């Protein structure tokens, strides 16, 4: 359900995930996360936005990718996100490549 709606919102439609984490991709993701995402997020605590360590357990990859790549579309149209906006309020322009690296880091940290 929520992945299909995330796909319709776009731009990402599908993400096939490796059985194993690509450690080198994740490391680039780590650097990007610490550049861009830590302005508002932490792994274990609430900050400006929700804690993210376990985001890949509660969400799928298309939702996560389109949150990064199309935040306005997600806020306007995705029921999960609309609720979060009500809770956290209203407040970057990554490439898909960058977003996919960050996704890989998010998958790695959930395994920690
Ligand atoms: C502050 C200016 C933010 C920056 C920079 C990033 N995010 Fe964010 N994110 C922020 C908020 C306030 C919220 C809640 C919704 C709202 O607009 O009020 C979010 C939400 C997310 C989510 C959804 C979490 C869930 O449990 O479903 C994800 C996956 C997310 N944010 C990821 C993320 C990443 C990876 C970022 C660096 C590229 C990033 N956000 C930046 C606020 C801000």
PDB file of C-alpha atoms in Angstrom, residues 39-105:
ATOM      1  CA  UNK A  39      20.810  19.429  10.093  1.00  0.00           C
ATOM      2  CA  UNK A  40      17.454  17.981  11.165  1.00  0.00           C
ATOM      3  CA  UNK A  41      17.754  14.292  12.037  1.00  0.00           C
ATOM      4  CA  UNK A  42      19.509  11.918  14.388  1.00  0.00           C
ATOM      5  CA  UNK A  43      19.607   8.138  14.274  1.00  0.00           C
ATOM      6  CA  UNK A  44      18.205   7.417  17.770  1.00  0.00           C
ATOM      7  CA  UNK A  45      16.496  10.639  18.982  1.00  0.00           C
ATOM      8  CA  UNK A  46      13.900  13.063  17.721  1.00  0.00           C
ATOM      9  CA  UNK A  47      15.369  16.382  16.505  1.00  0.00           C
ATOM     10  CA  UNK A  48      13.732  18.648  13.949  1.00  0.00           C
ATOM     11  CA  UNK A  49      12.454  15.514  12.193  1.00  0.00           C
ATOM     12  CA  UNK A  50      11.899  11.935  13.352  1.00  0.00           C
ATOM     13  CA  UNK A  51      14.683   9.593  14.358  1.00  0.00           C
ATOM     14  CA  UNK A  52      15.873   7.558  11.363  1.00  0.00           C
ATOM     15  CA  UNK A  53      17.900   4.547  12.477  1.00  0.00           C
ATOM     16  CA  UNK A  54      14.974   2.186  11.887  1.00  0.00           C
ATOM     17  CA  UNK A  55      13.300   4.022   9.045  1.00  0.00           C
ATOM     18  CA  UNK A  56      14.076   1.147   6.673  1.00  0.00           C
ATOM     19  CA  UNK A  57      12.277  -1.231   9.063  1.00  0.00           C
ATOM     20  CA  UNK A  58       9.039   0.787   9.168  1.00  0.00           C
ATOM     21  CA  UNK A  59       9.166   2.181   5.572  1.00  0.00           C
ATOM     22  CA  UNK A  60      10.089   0.874   2.146  1.00  0.00           C
ATOM     23  CA  UNK A  61      12.739   2.153  -0.195  1.00  0.00           C
ATOM     24  CA  UNK A  62      10.479   3.992  -2.663  1.00  0.00           C
ATOM     25  CA  UNK A  63       8.934   6.032   0.160  1.00  0.00           C
ATOM     26  CA  UNK A  64      12.375   6.850   1.547  1.00  0.00           C
ATOM     27  CA  UNK A  65      13.796   7.769  -1.834  1.00  0.00           C
ATOM     28  CA  UNK A  66      10.859   9.976  -2.799  1.00  0.00           C
ATOM     29  CA  UNK A  67      10.934  11.715   0.600  1.00  0.00           C
ATOM     30  CA  UNK A  68      14.434  12.844  -0.350  1.00  0.00           C
ATOM     31  CA  UNK A  69      13.756  13.519  -4.011  1.00  0.00           C
ATOM     32  CA  UNK A  70      10.213  14.872  -3.910  1.00  0.00           C
ATOM     33  CA  UNK A  71       9.500  16.098  -0.428  1.00  0.00           C
ATOM     34  CA  UNK A  72       6.745  18.483  -1.568  1.00  0.00           C
ATOM     35  CA  UNK A  73       4.918  15.733  -3.442  1.00  0.00           C
ATOM     36  CA  UNK A  74       5.180  13.416  -0.451  1.00  0.00           C
ATOM     37  CA  UNK A  75       3.911  16.115   1.918  1.00  0.00           C
ATOM     38  CA  UNK A  76       0.959  16.921  -0.373  1.00  0.00           C
ATOM     39  CA  UNK A  77      -0.079  13.386  -1.315  1.00  0.00           C
ATOM     40  CA  UNK A  78       1.300  10.605   0.905  1.00  0.00           C
ATOM     41  CA  UNK A  79      -0.854   9.839   3.943  1.00  0.00           C
ATOM     42  CA  UNK A  80       2.081   8.746   6.096  1.00  0.00           C
ATOM     43  CA  UNK A  81       3.962  11.939   5.348  1.00  0.00           C
ATOM     44  CA  UNK A  82       0.902  14.228   5.677  1.00  0.00           C
ATOM     45  CA  UNK A  83       0.501  13.030   9.225  1.00  0.00           C
ATOM     46  CA  UNK A  84       4.164  13.577  10.020  1.00  0.00           C
ATOM     47  CA  UNK A  85       3.856  17.167   8.730  1.00  0.00           C
ATOM     48  CA  UNK A  86       1.039  17.735  11.224  1.00  0.00           C
ATOM     49  CA  UNK A  87       3.341  16.432  13.992  1.00  0.00           C
ATOM     50  CA  UNK A  88       6.703  18.009  13.087  1.00  0.00           C
ATOM     51  CA  UNK A  89       5.815  21.115  11.043  1.00  0.00           C
ATOM     52  CA  UNK A  90       7.026  22.687   7.847  1.00  0.00           C
ATOM     53  CA  UNK A  91      10.582  23.829   7.296  1.00  0.00           C
ATOM     54  CA  UNK A  92      18.359  20.438  -0.282  1.00  0.00           C
ATOM     55  CA  UNK A  93      18.225  19.187  -3.872  1.00  0.00           C
ATOM     56  CA  UNK A  94      19.943  15.791  -3.937  1.00  0.00           C
ATOM     57  CA  UNK A  95      20.482  13.652  -6.981  1.00  0.00           C
ATOM     58  CA  UNK A  96      18.958  10.214  -7.245  1.00  0.00           C
ATOM     59  CA  UNK A  97      22.496   8.792  -6.975  1.00  0.00           C
ATOM     60  CA  UNK A  98      23.052  10.648  -3.705  1.00  0.00           C
ATOM     61  CA  UNK A  99      19.694   9.581  -2.362  1.00  0.00           C
ATOM     62  CA  UNK A 100      20.404   5.949  -3.217  1.00  0.00           C
ATOM     63  CA  UNK A 101      23.740   6.138  -1.342  1.00  0.00           C
ATOM     64  CA  UNK A 102      21.958   7.593   1.686  1.00  0.00           C
ATOM     65  CA  UNK A 103      19.380   4.788   1.462  1.00  0.00           C
ATOM     66  CA  UNK A 104      22.197   2.268   1.605  1.00  0.00           C
ATOM     67  CA  UNK A 105      23.577   3.951   4.756  1.00  0.00           C
TER      68      UNK A 105
END
